[PDB]
């Protein structure tokens, strides 16, 4: 995403920085996204969604 940088690189472009063929980059995105799915990891952000 574009967090304090004005892109939003794509899966290969982030994998271009680290020479990874966008598959482990997609997994390590999905690993960290699943890492932020947990209670007492999403106790402030779940309240930030309009519910």
């Amino acid at each position: 995403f574009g967090i304090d940088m004005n892109t939003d690189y794509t899966l290969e472009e982030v994998g271009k920085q680290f020479d990874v063929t966008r598959e482990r980059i997609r997994q390590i995105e999905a690993k960290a996204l699943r890492k932020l799915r947990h209670p007492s990891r999403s106790e402030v952000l779940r309240s930030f969604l309009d519910d």
Partner: protein
């Protein structure tokens, strides 16, 4: 304590310990603080570094092994 019926990834633990806990079918929090050190150990592919995992993961909120609670649920 009202939270204690939460499944496996409440504690952010490793696929070693999580694999062993879903093999033990231990997911809720009232059941994992029931049994003590060697009582937690005797299931396969778990050892003392996963014991340090269990120790730090229950010292991250301050409950210990010995809460053998009943009428649950």
């Amino acid at each position: 304590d009202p939270i204690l019926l939460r499944p496996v990834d409440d504690l952010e633990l490793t696929v070693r310990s999580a694999n062993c806990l879903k093999a033990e079918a231990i997911h809720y929090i009232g059941d994992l603080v029931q049994r003590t050190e060697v009582e937690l150990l005797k299931t396969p592919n778990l050892g003392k570094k996963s014991l340090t995992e269990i120790k730090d993961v229950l010292a991250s909120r301050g409950l210990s092994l010995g809460m053998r609670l009943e009428n649950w649920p």
